[PDB]
Amino acid sequence: KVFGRCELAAAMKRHGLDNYRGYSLGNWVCAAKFESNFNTQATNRNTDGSTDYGILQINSRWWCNDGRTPGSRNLCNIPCSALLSSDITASVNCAKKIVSDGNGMNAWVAWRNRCKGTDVQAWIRGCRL
Numbered sequence: 009k010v011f012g013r014c015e016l017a018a019a020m021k022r023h024g025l026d027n028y029r030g031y032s033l034g035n036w037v038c039a040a041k042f043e044s045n046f047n048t049q050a051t052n053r054n055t056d057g058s059t060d061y062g063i064l065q066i067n068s069r070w071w072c073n074d075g076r077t078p079g080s081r082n083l084c085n086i087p088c089s090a091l092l093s094s095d096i097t098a099s100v101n102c103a104k105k106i107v108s109d110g111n112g113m114n115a116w117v118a119w120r121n122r123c124k125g126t127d128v129q130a131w132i133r134g135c136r137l
């Protein structure tokens with residue numbers, strides 16, 4: 009599924025992301041925009057043997073199991089295919105675990121490079137929330 013911005017914001021709010029660990033909703037929408045362009049089926053296959061999966065481009069070395077990645081930790085305790093669904097619940101649950109395991113949002117390279125220090129409220133402006 010390719011989400012709209014406001015539709016994704018509403019889904020993320022229903023799943024508890026607004027102000028999760030001090031990160032406002034616009035941060036999460038901005039991260040999804042620049043990681044995947046709002047596409048739930050996005051995959052990026054890296055040269056190190058790992059793959060980034062889904063709307064938040066979660067990596068297979070530490071977070072999910074794809075059976076093909078060296079050094080796998082599977083800290084979200086899920087198959088990586090669960091991150092390619094049209095429903096965002098598995099991606100949101102794993103994103104919460106990434107911040108709970110002592111990372112901030114710096115774990116997402118696109119957040120650090122394209123969202124940090126910007127007006128992230130722009131990403132939710134005008135939406136029905």
Ligand SMILES: [Cl-]
Pocket residue numbers: 026032033034132
């Ligand atoms: Cl907000």
